[PDB]
Amino acid sequence: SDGSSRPYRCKIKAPGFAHLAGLDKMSKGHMLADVVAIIGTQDIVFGEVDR
Amino acid sequence: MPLVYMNIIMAFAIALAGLLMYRSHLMSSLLCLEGMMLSLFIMSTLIILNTHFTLANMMPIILLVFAACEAALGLSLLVMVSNTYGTDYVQNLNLLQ
Amino acid sequence: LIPHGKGGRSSVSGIVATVFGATGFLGRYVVNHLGRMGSQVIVPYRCEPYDTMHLRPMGDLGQIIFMEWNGKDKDSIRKVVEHSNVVINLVGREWETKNFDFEDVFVKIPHAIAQVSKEAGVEKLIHISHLNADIKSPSRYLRSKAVGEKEVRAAFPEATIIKPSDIFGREDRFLNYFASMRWFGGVPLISLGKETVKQPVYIVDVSKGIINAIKDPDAKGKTFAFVGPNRYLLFDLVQYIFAVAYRPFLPYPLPHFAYRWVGRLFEVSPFEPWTTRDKVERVHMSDMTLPHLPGLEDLGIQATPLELKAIEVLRRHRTYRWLTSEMEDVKPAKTVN
Amino acid sequence: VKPIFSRDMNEAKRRVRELYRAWYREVPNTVHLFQLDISVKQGRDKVREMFMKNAHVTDPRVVDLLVIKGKMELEETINVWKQRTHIMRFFHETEAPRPTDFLSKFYVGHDP
Amino acid sequence: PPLTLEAIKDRVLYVLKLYDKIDPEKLSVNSHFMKDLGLDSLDQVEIIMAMEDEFGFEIPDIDAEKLMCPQEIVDYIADKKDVYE
Amino acid sequence: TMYIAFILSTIFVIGFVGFSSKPSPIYGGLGLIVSGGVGCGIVLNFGGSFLGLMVFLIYLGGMLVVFGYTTAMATEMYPEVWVSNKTVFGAFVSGLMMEFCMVYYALKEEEVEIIFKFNGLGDWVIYDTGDSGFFSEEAMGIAALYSYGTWLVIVTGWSLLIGVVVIMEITRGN
Amino acid sequence: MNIMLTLLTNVTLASLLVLIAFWLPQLNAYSEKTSPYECGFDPMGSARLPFSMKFFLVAITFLLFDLEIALLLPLPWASQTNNLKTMLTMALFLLILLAASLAYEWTQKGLEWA
Amino acid sequence: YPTKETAHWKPPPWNDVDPPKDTLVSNLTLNFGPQHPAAHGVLRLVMELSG
Amino acid sequence: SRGEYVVAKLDDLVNWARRSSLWPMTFGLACCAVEMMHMAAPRYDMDRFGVVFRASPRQSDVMIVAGTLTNKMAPALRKVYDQMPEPRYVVSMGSCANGGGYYHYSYSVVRGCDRIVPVDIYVPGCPPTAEALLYGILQLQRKIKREKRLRIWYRR
Amino acid sequence: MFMINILSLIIPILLAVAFLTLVERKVLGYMQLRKGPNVVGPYGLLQPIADALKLFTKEPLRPATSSISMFIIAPILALSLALTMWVPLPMPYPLINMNLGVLFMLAMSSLAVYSILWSGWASNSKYALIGALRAVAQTISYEVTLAIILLSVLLMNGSYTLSTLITTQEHIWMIFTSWPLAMMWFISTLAETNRAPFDLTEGESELVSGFNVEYAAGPFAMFFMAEYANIIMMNAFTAILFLGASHDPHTPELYTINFVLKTLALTITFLWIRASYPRFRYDQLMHLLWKSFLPLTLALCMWHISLPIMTASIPPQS
Ligand SMILES: NC(=O)C1=CN([C@@H]2O[C@H](COP(=O)(O)OP(=O)(O)OC[C@H]3O[C@@H](n4cnc5c(N)ncnc54)[C@H](OP(=O)(O)O)[C@@H]3O)[C@@H](O)[C@H]2O)C=CC1
Numbered sequence A: 001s002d003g004s005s006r007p008y009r010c011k012i013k014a015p016g017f018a019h020l021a022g023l024d025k026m027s028k029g030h031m032l033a034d035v036v037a038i039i040g041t042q043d044i045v046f047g048e049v050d051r
Numbered sequence B: 001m002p003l004v005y006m007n008i009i010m011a012f013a014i015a016l017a018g019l020l021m022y023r024s025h026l027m028s029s030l031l032c033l034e035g036m037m038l039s040l041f042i043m044s045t046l047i048i049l050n051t052h053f054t055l056a057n058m059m060p061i062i063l064l065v066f067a068a069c070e071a072a073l074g075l076s077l078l079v080m081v082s083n084t085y086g087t088d089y090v091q092n093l094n095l096l097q
Numbered sequence C: 001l002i003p004h005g006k007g008g009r010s011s012v013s014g015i016v017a018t019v020f021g022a023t024g025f026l027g028r029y030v031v032n033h034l035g036r037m038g039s040q041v042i043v044p045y046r047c048e049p050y051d052t053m054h055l056r057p058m059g060d061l062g063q064i065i066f067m068e069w070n071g072k073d074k075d076s077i078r079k080v081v082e083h084s085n086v087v088i089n090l091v092g093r094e095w096e097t098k099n100f101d102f103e104d105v106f107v108k109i110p111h112a113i114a115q116v117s118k119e120a121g122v123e124k125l126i127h128i129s130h131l132n133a134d135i136k137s138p139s140r141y142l143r144s145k146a147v148g149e150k151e152v153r154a155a156f157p158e159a160t161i162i163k164p165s166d167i168f169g170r171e172d173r174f175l176n177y178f179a180s181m182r183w184f185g186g187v188p189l190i191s192l193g194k195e196t197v198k199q200p201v202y203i204v205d206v207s208k209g210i211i212n213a214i215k216d217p218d219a220k221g222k223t224f225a226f227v228g229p230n231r232y233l234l235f236d237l238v239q240y241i242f243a244v245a246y247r248p249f250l251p252y253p254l255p256h257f258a259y260r261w262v263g264r265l266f267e268v269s270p271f272e273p274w275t276t277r278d279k280v281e282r283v284h285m286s287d288m289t290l291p292h293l294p295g296l297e298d299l300g301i302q303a304t305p306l307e308l309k310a311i312e313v314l315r316r317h318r319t320y321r322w323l324t325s326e327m328e329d330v331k332p333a334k335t336v337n
Numbered sequence D: 001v002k003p004i005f006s007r008d009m010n011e012a013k014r015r016v017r018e019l020y021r022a023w024y025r026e027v028p029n030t031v032h033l034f035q036l037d038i039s040v041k042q043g044r045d046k047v048r049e050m051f052m053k054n055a056h057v058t059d060p061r062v063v064d065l066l067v068i069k070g071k072m073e074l075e076e077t078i079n080v081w082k083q084r085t086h087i088m089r090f091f092h093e094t095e096a097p098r099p100t101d102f103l104s105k106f107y108v109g110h111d112p
Numbered sequence E: 001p002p003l004t005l006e007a008i009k010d011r012v013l014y015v016l017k018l019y020d021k022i023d024p025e026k027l028s029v030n031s032h033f034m035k036d037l038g039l040d041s042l043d044q045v046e047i048i049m050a051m052e053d054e055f056g057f058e059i060p061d062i063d064a065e066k067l068m069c070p071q072e073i074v075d076y077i078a079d080k081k082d083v084y085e
Numbered sequence F: 001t002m003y004i005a006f007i008l009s010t011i012f013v014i015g016f017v018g019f020s021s022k023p024s025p026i027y028g029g030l031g032l033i034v035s036g037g038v039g040c041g042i043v044l045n046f047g048g049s050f051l052g053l054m055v056f057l058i059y060l061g062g063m064l065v066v067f068g069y070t071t072a073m074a075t076e077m078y079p080e081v082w083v084s085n086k087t088v089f090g091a092f093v094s095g096l097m098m099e100f101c102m103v104y105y106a107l108k109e110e111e112v113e114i115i116f117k118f119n120g121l122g123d124w125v126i127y128d129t130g131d132s133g134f135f136s137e138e139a140m141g142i143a144a145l146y147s148y149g150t151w152l153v154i155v156t157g158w159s160l161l162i163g164v165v166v167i168m169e170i171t172r173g174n
Numbered sequence G: 001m002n003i004m005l006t007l008l009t010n011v012t013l014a015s016l017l018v019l020i021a022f023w024l025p026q027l028n029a030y031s032e033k034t035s036p037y038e039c040g041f042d043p044m045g046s047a048r049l050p051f052s053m054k055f056f057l058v059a060i061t062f063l064l065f066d067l068e069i070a071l072l073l074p075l076p077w078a079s080q081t082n083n084l085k086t087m088l089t090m091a092l093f094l095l096i097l098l099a100a101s102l103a104y105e106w107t108q109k110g111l112e113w114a
Numbered sequence H: 001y002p003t004k005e006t007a008h009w010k011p012p013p014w015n016d017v018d019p020p021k022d023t024l025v026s027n028l029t030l031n032f033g034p035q036h037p038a039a040h041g042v043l044r045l046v047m048e049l050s051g
Numbered sequence I: 001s002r003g004e005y006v007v008a009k010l011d012d013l014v015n016w017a018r019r020s021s022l023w024p025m026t027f028g029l030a031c032c033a034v035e036m037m038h039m040a041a042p043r044y045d046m047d048r049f050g051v052v053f054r055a056s057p058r059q060s061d062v063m064i065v066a067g068t069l070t071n072k073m074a075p076a077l078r079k080v081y082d083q084m085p086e087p088r089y090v091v092s093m094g095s096c097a098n099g100g101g102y103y104h105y106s107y108s109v110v111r112g113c114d115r116i117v118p119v120d121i122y123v124p125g126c127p128p129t130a131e132a133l134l135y136g137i138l139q140l141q142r143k144i145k146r147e148k149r150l151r152i153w154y155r156r
Numbered sequence J: 001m002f003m004i005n006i007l008s009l010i011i012p013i014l015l016a017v018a019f020l021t022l023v024e025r026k027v028l029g030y031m032q033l034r035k036g037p038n039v040v041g042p043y044g045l046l047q048p049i050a051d052a053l054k055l056f057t058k059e060p061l062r063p064a065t066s067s068i069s070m071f072i073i074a075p076i077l078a079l080s081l082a083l084t085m086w087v088p089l090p091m092p093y094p095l096i097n098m099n100l101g102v103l104f105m106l107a108m109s110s111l112a113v114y115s116i117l118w119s120g121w122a123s124n125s126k127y128a129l130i131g132a133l134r135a136v137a138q139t140i141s142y143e144v145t146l147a148i149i150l151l152s153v154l155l156m157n158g159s160y161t162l163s164t165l166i167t168t169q170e171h172i173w174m175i176f177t178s179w180p181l182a183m184m185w186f187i188s189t190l191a192e193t194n195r196a197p198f199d200l201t202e203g204e205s206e207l208v209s210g211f212n213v214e215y216a217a218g219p220f221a222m223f224f225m226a227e228y229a230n231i232i233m234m235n236a237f238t239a240i241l242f243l244g245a246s247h248d249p250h251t252p253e254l255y256t257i258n259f260v261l262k263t264l265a266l267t268i269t270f271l272w273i274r275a276s277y278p279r280f281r282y283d284q285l286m287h288l289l290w291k292s293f294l295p296l297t298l299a300l301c302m303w304h305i306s307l308p309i310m311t312a313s314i315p316p317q318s
């Protein structure tokens, strides 16, 4: 808050963002279907990632 | 000899000349060889069907086996040559024909 | 209205252009250059909404306005002119439909358009006719279009009249056609070589030229005619066609009558025939080289050479073996002139 | 005061020349792979022009920062990141012409 | 072949004659490539990269900092070819 | 008569004309498919049906598939069709004229002068009475392989086995 | 005959469906519409070399089993031979080797499939 | 008795002729979505997959 | 047995055909993906209307554009639209992409979905209730049913 | 008039694949609680023809990158063989009395997938090539065990002729004798036909409609159609081969009335499989086969080789 009625900056942590960052470490060398399942275990939602 | 046999034999002669005209990537040669194999098979079986020389009914299939067998081997070598190049006959290391 | 703001998709302009039969190759481009200006348009459909649908993006919310109409009813054409500041005629047809007899299309419709353009006090009227519209025994289109040309000139004399010197584009019914003559086998030449000669103009150039013509105060009753910078020989031309389409090239020399036997053979199809005897006469007659008439450069626009632009036009005809290739590889065709 | 990359000018100019080499040589591959129908020369010229666009920058660190922002683009075209649209974007080809002549502008619009 | 120095010079000036900024009148071997020729500084890089595109080896750009005269670069081509005759 | 077996032999031979010419292995695989079905048909005409269906199964249902794998490993961009080169297409025509000369020789009805004599006329003529009880000659003829011909079974078993071993000792080396 | 007739009617049927499939909708093909699908964005390159040893390393084993089953086929008829003890060993024998072959692959880690 | 045309050719390696090994450069690279149902409508997971 | 009569019959036949089992593909980009799914949820079941979500445009026709569009995304959208077979349609959905909607003023949105593709029916909402969507597509069928290329083709 | 018999074999079956599609969406619907297609019917019944008309009416583009010849010839072969496999099938009376038509069923089934290989090869797309390739993997990998277990269940009927397979089931049914092989036959038919848990050729979410993608209107209808041809056909095949029935020659029709039940009872089950299990992934798909199915297929095979001798129960046919 700047004190005004319009908030000055509102960075929004998105839990999915970190996960998806960690994905490629988590998914090296795995079969291509398994990377598809593993995207899903990350249960990510891109609307939250892109904020 | 009836004309049909002559025709199959000629299919053999083409199935050889094709192997020896021999060009570019060699996978074509394993094909042409297998075609050759097939012509020998058919030419055998027609005969064993002809004279009712019954025991020899076993041969063509056995023929087929080993013949197919060597071809089955052949691909493996191609793999290796494919492994270092992306195959072509045009590239050979060895010297002196 | 007085124009406002930077020219742009949101920009207003006074133009409330009315384009007829825009469903075709021209003037989809002409509407687009109106649309980048943001100028309003009232393109009216005869056909079906569906084919018209891709026209929609070109506008900006309220801009483009389809209107139902018929060229035959008088008031039906009174409809779409009814508030138009300018009215433009791009209507043309190569193969004579039944119900639209080949004459009225080039006569009656431009006529009603012209006189209604009078009554509605339309600020400008404009109309198209092929350069060879000058009367000639072959082909009824040059003549019928000459008749409506002279008619609208007799009815709306201050109208400028387009005389385009063959436009080449991706959506062309011409270059694609000779590109597609491969499908039969050879390419029917009446006698090869200099039997006939043609010059071409980029479609984009024609469009820019038309709207520039509305941008030109001087372009009043003058009969504008459009020609590309280069000059080519039909034989070497088709040679360049299969030089860019990479398809095998077979010249197919032919006694002149038989080709017309062919056109009569192919007019039979109920649908839209690939060829017609009218088109057969579109074939072998060369364009006249007269430059003295008001024309494209007089507008200040310079023609884009065909030589760099045929490639995009014909890549779809390419076999997969050759589907990716630089145009420069093909070699610029020699210019006869 | 911490420099980004090269100390003083010229050391950074060589960087940019290297960059021109990379872009220039890459361009025909760009026209080939992307099926761009721009004249093969034109891309090169346009590259040279874009290189002329900042041909008066004179700060220390700012120029190396400029080659940082210059790497990423060839970085993208080489990885087929961006596309025909995205790389054709530089030519501004759909724009209506805008003469800089005072009177010309003067007739057209209210202007600044 | 032995690659004579004349082949090198002939090729250098050949590529520089094929190039546009260097008009044939502008051409002069001993003359300093920038001090006389009016061509833009990028042209150094363009023609050098083309010439080395012919001789085939990458020019490290310290050698782009050579220049002085085109002939000194020819001398460097002799230095790499090690023919120097 | 129909000469149907013989015309099948002709399609067979052109199957090798388009096959022995060498225009990307995949199309050649088509060549052996056509020649394959034609083959099983031809041997079927004498009624050795089990064998024709061996080749129509074991060969074409086996081989040309694994070749449909090699091309995945070989391919190279822009594989050539038969029409895609003057030597390939020239070769195909080169086969066609020859085999057609053979058919013209069949029109001549004279015994073939090539290599060695081909007696001519229709195929049927060589047939003899196929009289038998409720069993085809082929059936017990191949059934004999086990009981009455153990030796071949031994060497084939051994051979195929050690062939698997060879495949190992080639691929594992990498 | 019989079978050739049904082959011809089937193939002609299918070919008929093809011809009524193409020469019917009668609409506008054009470039980019005809460009290959690639989940939106254009392909980075035409299909090349999805190489894998793990293809042939097993697929070849397929081929050498299929040759084996080719020898298994005579069995139902061979079962009625006059002298089964002469046969029976072999009837088992090949199967053992079939299994044996597999077994050899099973544990030289040559069977990584995938 | 070499010919000069043969003389240009190098003597055979004393073992493995290793240099050619540098030559293999096989790779593939490919993209999921956005359309792709597993890509949740808005992901472009480009990846350099092997076989 | 007038030719026009038969044309009316075939018109009815193909337009009824296409309208009776259209096969959407879906850019459920943003958050209106989920409401799309509730159309396909058992309680409303799009399938009983015959419509069935099948991926890969080449096997599909009508296109739903659920959810907010963005700049980087747009070219892919135009690609997919181009690769569809005729007679392709689309459907803008929500306040999403009717015209940016909530995000009308940002550098990355591309205002309407209209500015890259020629939209058919609009289905306003934010999210539209899946049922309002259902009314949407039924309205789409009541627009296909008025299609009549055959009547017009004969007329021309 | 043999020709009208053939036509009488080909029309009804195509009708059957259409209504098979509709049943698929129906049952597979009610597993999901949601009703299947309904509104256009009244009971949905009119749907499939509206569907097919929607397809064939729709434009089928010839892809710019694709070679055209293979691209067209593949679907043709698909419907071709999909129909041709039907001919020697005893219902009760085979349209053709092949001496060894079972082996022929294997022949057709084995040339089937080759069409898939072309379907993905000429399609030129990345997804096309990868999906087609893995497809051919799973397929062949299952045809080997396929044909072996079919052999072992055929040692005891007597011979490869099909009609005799009725005669050998005049009482107990084959299934009680060798059900485990019936299991493996079932699953091998569940994968060879490329179905529910063994789902890979279509790929679906894994590979957006797999090999089949680039095909547009009609050819797609052909692969789709042919696929269902194989599903109902292997189902019927299993039915006659593992489930016998009473057969009075004087009233053949009675038998058929029974037979379509016994086969339909199978086809529905695939759908009721489809509603139940997630797909395997290409590793495990081949893992369970080479590692686990196969050795049992062999042990069972020697066992079935050996029963007729120990039991002195050798089947009649010469
Ligand atoms: N290269 C060229 O093509 C050149 C063309 N011209 C002239 O310029 C004009 C523009 O050419 P182009 O646009 O390519 O031709 P098109 O056929 O593409 O455009 C004509 C359009 O007008 C419609 N139309 C016209 N009259 C009627 C009618 N009575 N009923 C229904 N529809 C009608 C047509 O059918 P609908 O709208 O119903 O679909 C079509 O959409 C043409 O008239 C041509 O003679 C001149 C020089 C060169």
Ligand code: SF4
Pocket: I030, I031, I032, I066, I067, I068, I094, I095, I096, I097, I101, I102, I125, I126, I127, I128
């Ligand atoms: S509609 Fe509501 S939900 Fe869908 S995008 Fe616009 S705002 Fe987000």
